[model samples]
Target: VPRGSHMMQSGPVIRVAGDSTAVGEGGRWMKEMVEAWGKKTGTRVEYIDSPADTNDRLALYQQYWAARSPDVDVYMIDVIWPGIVAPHALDLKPYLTEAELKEFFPRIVQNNTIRGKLTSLPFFTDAGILYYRKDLLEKYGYTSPPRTWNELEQMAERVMEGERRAGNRDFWGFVFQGKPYEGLTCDALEWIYSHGGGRIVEPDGTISVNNGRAALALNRAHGWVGRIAPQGVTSYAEEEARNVWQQGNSLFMRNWPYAYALGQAEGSPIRGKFGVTVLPKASADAPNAATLGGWQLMVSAYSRYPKEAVDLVKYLASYEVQKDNAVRLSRLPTRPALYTDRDVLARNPWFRDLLPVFQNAVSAPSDVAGARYNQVSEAIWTEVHSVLTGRKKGEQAVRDLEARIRRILRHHHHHH
Candidate 1:
């Protein structure tokens, strides 16, 4: 029997969706990679644009899963989604050899595996880092990036003051994703964790955000606004922070690695002027924490072409493709060896500095929150944003946030 018209009559067709491949180098590279895979395998592959918004993309996928539709053979999912979508994704463990599985960072490999089912392959990974003015640091007589929050504040204030006194009134000390979104959660996670406040929800399901250290961390960040950071920073997201940094208005930026390539892009004002390091710790004795972020590729359990879909997944997650992604897209590779690869390091030397950051990165409480992870993250960012905006003190915010998270988890408990 002939398959649906969307499938080519001449050959088996696999439909891959999401991470909308229609913009910039990301779009072009995706087309090249998937088309190359199709040519090599002699199977037709189609790339379909899903909702660009992460929440909308998940909503669409959930509908497809509910209908048991094979419309999409492969899915690009967030790293935190394996457990949420586990039941509807194919077990990839049997398809991947032990040697191949060992190539990816174990934390990500473990994250993709839920209930012993390997649901996805790590396509690329992300962790937060500190971006600073290389020239500014040298000019200020600083030998290295700040290792602790205190150092950063001091360095940022000093540099910013000097720059402003030299007549750049727009200059500010530091910029970050201070908006009330998932980015805020990622940012706040590092601040809280590095300050000795445990992950918001401990693995054992403890609500751990309401603590002295957590409150202090929030308080410290709050002080940055209108002092070190611009007053408008409270509304800034990744791109906004990057814009200020790229325009040479900010002394430092906290962002993902994507900003690196953009900053170095030809004609950019700050090109070749910056460097990145692991974000600062709360104190000399405190450990640094970068929030774990990334995307994964999984075959839909309902795919009629599961084998072909798995092949595409394997190809995309292969070392070669990841290397291409790292150099071209400036994506951080999931494989540790890529950090030391000559070509990768030549293109993104700062990746070497990130080796330790990725190694010690902290994950969100998605595993414990399950499908309710969004609610949990919302409670975090909303309260943390209030602190940043000065609407609530960090102490009161954490207590309120603790109450909000407890209610969210309690609801999940009764329902689950």
Candidate 2:
């Protein structure tokens, strides 16, 4: 039952359209590993690089699906957009056995299977982690990162004032992705969930952001805009936030694990002066949540090599490749067993401790919002970003968001 051990019955070529990791953009480790699979089998493999931003990648995939093009054999499905594109993807149930389905993380499996057709296989998993300037904390006599929102604000204020006194005028206290996109939705979800707020769209598909503590989350973040965060923060995406933090211009950041690798790269400014921990909670008893974020691999329904395509996905999701993903690139593994693997835990100790973090993380509204999930997230970020940029008030923004989502759900019945 070892992963990547299956051999295709015939020669079938496949083209992979995936995220930055698919080609190993930040690091070329994954690209080499994928090509190694091709060398082992007679099948040929090709890669179609997609956008670093989720929205651009979405538009490209939409173009291909619209034309029903078979040129792309495999599609790297975003964690939230699969419901919208599942019809064009191969129903993997005929290919995956019950045992295989049971092997993946249960929530991920549930997220990929639409109306009983396994549409995709999780390639890796993600959760938002708080990256802080360890050197700044130590210099200020603090022992660990902030545990509560107030602690983070207090620490940030003291550090900012001290750095200013020392003549580091450009060093801000915090940075994060505040742009109006999917990344914003991830950050917004964490803010609300940690503040004892409801998921914007309830599991029953009711739009409930207006009635919950969602405004509390927005206003709190708005307070940080001109104070802790720069006026330019409203324009930051993942790279923008990571770059500011990596350049040693900020004290803390909210980002994914990929930042760890790039920030620690050779000659990086804060190479050895950074540490990651769980994001700050709103209060001592509030929910500590990280949004479930990651990519899934789906075989294109138009692909001529369905079996070969599935096999390729299997190889990438294989235990061996996943472990390699962790130790080599710092990407979190999707297979739960990898967390406790002696060698894996030994090499990446952070992997073991993060299991609980992943277990406690909340899934985005994609689960119940169905194909309209993207539109719901879009409405959320647009309204919330308006609040962050001062175009609207907190509660008013939430109300506006609820109205938009309700309209989207009423008209969108899983239509692609």
Candidate 3:
């Protein structure tokens, strides 16, 4: 195959479908870079619209793949989508070499693999981390960022109370994604996992939530309402919590790597005053868990331009392009070597520090849950959100969650 040509036949245009890639300056640059990659490789790049909603995009992929349509050459797949859509997506093992596969983070490569097939290559990565007001910690005479959840609460309360007393009622202690959505599932899992209590579904299809430790985690999160975290956080999604922190109204923000660069944007109030770190541990013994999240790029099993598709995937996944993406897109790189790269550190020093945090991040149950994953996440987040919204007590919410997950998993078990 001649770089971007179709099976060494002749010139061919490749249509790669993806969700919103244009956002801030990087989004624009990412689009331009994709175009440049196509041009550089002598492939005509065409954009096919994909619905922003994950479910909708999956539906589209399912429909197209069922028909074995050859039009869509490449797919921008989510972490959870690979397992469910593997049969319809190309297995990349044959297209990529062992050396190329070794360049990515091991866990990421593991996530993209379905059964025994290397289904996709991770394009970028995501993980939970702490974003705090560095200047505020110093101004409050606090010497360090909180290392434990309790310390975070104490520091946040003191800082929040001081700011409120000083006429900044808008100031808050912490902000996070607490809305009843996938974002909630991500946040809920971090809390549940960090407390040493995430066996919601055990190794043998057992339901283990509704226990004391699990309730402790949920209640602690619930207690954040109106005290340190605003009661309004129950309504906050990623951007909402991000706005709260970026506008300089909060002492701490719990979010992903992407927020770092956005917080440093031109007019961002916390631009130079904020710092990043791993999420606070539940205790000295308990680990601070971040949720594993990232995107992957795959070729269509039905594509006629598989060679060209792989070429584009390689171009986009290249170290130089990934570094550029890191600097401009605020995306975390999946290549372990990139963490120690001086240019990457110059872009975000915390990238190197948070390497272990990302490596240790917990994945949602989507991997094993497969097609039932969405339902499982919905059931989990609904009960958890109920606790936050006062619809149920923490312990009670755990019980409800346990029952619901048991019901879902039991059915899944039977079907399996």
Candidate 4:
């Protein structure tokens, strides 16, 4: 397979199906990746664009994979879907060389590998970080952002209280994803892992999301939303949180790497006044963790041109392409080597500061059976929202979540 090889000459075009994040009209890195792959590999890669939301893309994939249609020759799978769609999707283990697999981050490669079979190749990567207004902290006699959850809470509360005293009604201390969806689950897990809470992963692959430490973490996260975060955050998604942070209305936020570029835009109030740091730990002893969130590329099992697709995958996953994308788009690179690339470091200096966060990042439990990850995540968001709204106490909400997750896992275990 050579760069720009015409797939139409030997077989049908490689059709990619994925969420809007990859296929959107303008500035979409997915399309750029495909074009670059085509140019470098000489393959004609076509795309089947869908709404950017993960759920919508999953539903679309389910329909296609259930039918085993070859029309869609590639899938841009979400980090959470490998377990759910593994049976329907083709196992790519045989296609991946040991050297190729070793090129990616260990946890990312591990996450996509199911039942000892490599299922997909990481495209880009993401991990949560704390975005805060440096100017505000300095103005308040603080030299740096808080490093512990308790300190974070104190700093945010004091800042908000002082702002209120100064008659600033619209400013807030912190904002985060609290909506009832996957975003909520990602946020909750980050807080949970930071608090030394362990997810349910049995040695035999049984998953249990209902545990005392996990429940306590959820309760504590809900407590923060109740006591500090603005009420409207319960209705906010990634964009809303970004909007608040970008507009200088928030003292701190937990979001992905993309926000760094958005925050540095010209005329932005906090352009030079904000800094990115790892999420605060629950205590001095707790291990800091950030949820692994990003997409991966998988060749369709039904595609006639698997070799060409594999070539394209390798090309896109190459350090050169990944570093270029990271520099231009601020999307985190999956290739470990890119972290040390001079050009990438020059363009995104923040990566130097953020390398520690990536090194310490943790993922959700991989042993969760069926699509129980989604179910438990939904339940967590529901209870979190309820608790934040004062409709339920933190303890009661956590207890309910644990009970519901156990019931869900048990039912799935018996049926599957």
Candidate 5:
């Protein structure tokens, strides 16, 4: 292990606690890294799997951390939870060399670092995409997926009309995650960012989400959900929306890249007939924005064997392990260099299309403080859902969300 860390009497067995995505069957990078570490350093690393959902995994981590248990030596935490959980987790700066630190994407590094100390290493990454029926677009005489919101609106209308005319009752224009949760917040934020809306934090860390652009974006999403989306969307989450899209009932869907494999699977009507592209911009000049969704690996501060834990961490973040992950599971590599690997590229050809989106991806406003992060997201999404379902007007919903966000931020400022 790195110098200055105490040597252990026996090989350490580091335990990982995180969501299902972190410990999924295919993307078993952690498992592979642990096994590799045992061969290299004689340390036996083990993972204690938790639920796949972020909320469930977070609760489990909190319980383990609060009790000061050594059962979980490492925690694969949500990107937003680094701030709230940093105090309890291990400080990783001592283990990471300058060269090792430089290997990761800046955004991922920044997200996992708290107050200039590295708290975690980004393991995998995710971003949004516009998954469309390419065959349908071609049949309708459209050359490619829509580039702007107006084009998308027109295309969706045409497709929905055409599907209906063909006697298809299950068809719709678009399907998105609209349930009142973090998923809804993610979907809503992309629209806001695409419309030149300001974020909760400016580059200098100032509040900027109450502006006109933000309001306009929210209103547009509200209108689309009300008029074009299926009635069941208001109650739908990621799985629900993916189900609708996989069934080929919707012409356009806004979701992450994992859906690509499912859409391309056998027996699926839209398989091989779909094309993935960046989410449509609200205007021609607006930047294409998608929410940064992924997990990172961090060591717990209270672990008995910090050196062995760091060894496991470095092993997992290495290019060899990440490349295998990219090929076997289609998980995007956090390291920039792996994007050039031919074998990795062949398995996930969509990476070329998604690279730009990832380059321009934006984290949610909660990157700074996790205490009120989920609540703030919940508040905004609830009002959004309310407006989209006609339970409230856009003006009223925006006004309420702005006031609530201000209140939440003010409370966070005083507490932190």
Candidate 6:
């Protein structure tokens, strides 16, 4: 009964599809890791590259699932996907033991479980954090990074002004994901949640987005345009924000952990000039929030080799493999223990500061929205983006957003 012992034959091949080949250190590492597993199990394994764009990849996965095609056995899914993909995904409860499940961050595990089905296993995780220019802070005579929104605004203004007067004309105070997409949802969620506003939809199916705190958060962010943030930021996404940041044009940035590795890469201008920490809160006593963003692995129920696919998923999520990913790829480990691993911390020291941020990160309304999560997210970002772009006021937009989500939930049938 040894694992993969029945793979002596080559009749069935397990296919893995993900954005692993698109970018980041995960590309080559994934191929080698899967090949290593194949050799160890004597199992036939194939790596298929999926579209790097999230929406495009989602469409392809949906098409395959709708046809019940056994083309791909394992899928790398986004954190928000479990609820939507649960019907076509295998319940991993029988495959993963209670002990194995306990190693990961519980919130992530809980997020992947839709109703009673364990849809996926956390692969690598992401949470939004603030990246600041250490050199600029020191040059501007600031002793510490911002802990509250007002402090951030003050620091950015002073540093940006000094740097600009010193002839760095293109410098900006801050940058972030402002494009009207899923990234906007993540960005806006951090703002509202940290400001004491309720998550767009509460976990209990209640619509809680229409509120004064949420409006204040949006209005404040709106004030950043053409000031701390460039007006073009309204159209910027992850790469755009990082692009400005890595060029040393911005003093601070709100981005995910992946940007940490890139910023420290050799030849980068800001390689040793910056540091990261949890994002600032809206006020002194409010809780600081980071949006939960990450990918998970799931076995397709339509797979010809469900057992093999599940084994592959378990292998990738294994502590040993996750540790390697953390040390080498700068990817956050889903397993909490890796955060404290000696080798892991040695490579990415900033992770020590991010442990609590990940632990308490706010998740989107995926659980309550279920299959309608995408539509719900669209509604949220559209309204939030409108506020950011000055086309609508925060109070009016949030009110409209609440009404829209109510309609969406009303039409969403709870029973299958």
Per-prediction TM-score, please?
A: 0.87, 0.79, 0.83, 0.82, 0.86, 0.86
Off by over 4 Å in 3: 1-15, 18-56, 93-102, 199-210, 304-312, 412-416
Give a tens-digit lDDT track for model 1, residues 125-188.
9888999998999999999999899999999989988999999999999999999999999999
Prediction RMSDs, each to the true structure = 3.6, 6.1, 4.5, 4.6, 4.7, 4.4
Off by over 4 Å in 5: 1-29, 44-47, 51-56, 67-71, 93-99, 201-205, 391-395, 412-416
Tens-digit lDDT string for candidate 6 (81-173) = 887888889999998778989998887888788888899999998889999999999998998889999999999999988989999988999
Worst 10 residues of 6 by lDDT: 1-10
lDDT of 4 by residue, 1-416 (tens): 56565543564477777545444432366677777777666667786786677777788887878787878877888777677777655677787778877888877887787777677888888888899899899888899888998888889888988877898787888889988877777787777667776543432454444556666666666667646787788888999999988888889999988888778889887789899999888788888777787878887777777877777776667787778678877678887777778898898877766766766666665435556676766777787678666687656776787677667767434642
**Candidate 1 structure lDDT:** 0.89
Clash totals in order: 0, 0, 0, 7, 2, 0
Model 3, 1-416: lDDT tens digits are: 34664456557888878655543454456567678988787777887667667778888878889899998888888877776888877778887788988998876887777777778888888888898898999998998888888999999988987899999989999999889998898888888877888746643455677788788888899899888998999999999999999899999999987788788889888889988878887888987778878888888889998888888888888999899988876588888889899988997787887786766677777656677888889998899899888788878998888888767766434542
Q: Please give the lDDT score for candidate 3.
A: 0.82
Q: How accurate locally is residue 115 in candidate 6, as Cα lDDT from 0 to 100?
A: 81
TM-score pick, better of 3 and 5: 5
Deviation in Å, model 6, residue 160 alpha carbon: 2.8
Using TM-score as the measure, name the better of candidate 4 and candidate 6.
6
What lDDT would each prediction earn against the true structure? 0.89, 0.82, 0.82, 0.75, 0.78, 0.89
**Model 3 TM:** 0.83
Show model 1 residue runs off by greater than 4 Å: 1-14, 18-22, 25-28, 38-51, 94-99, 305-308, 412-416
lDDT of 6: 0.89
For candidate 4, the 10 contiguous residues with the lowest summed lDDT are 199-208
Tens-digit per-residue lDDT, 51-163, candidate 2: 87888998998898899888888887788866677788899888778887777777677678666778899888898888899899999999999988888989999999999
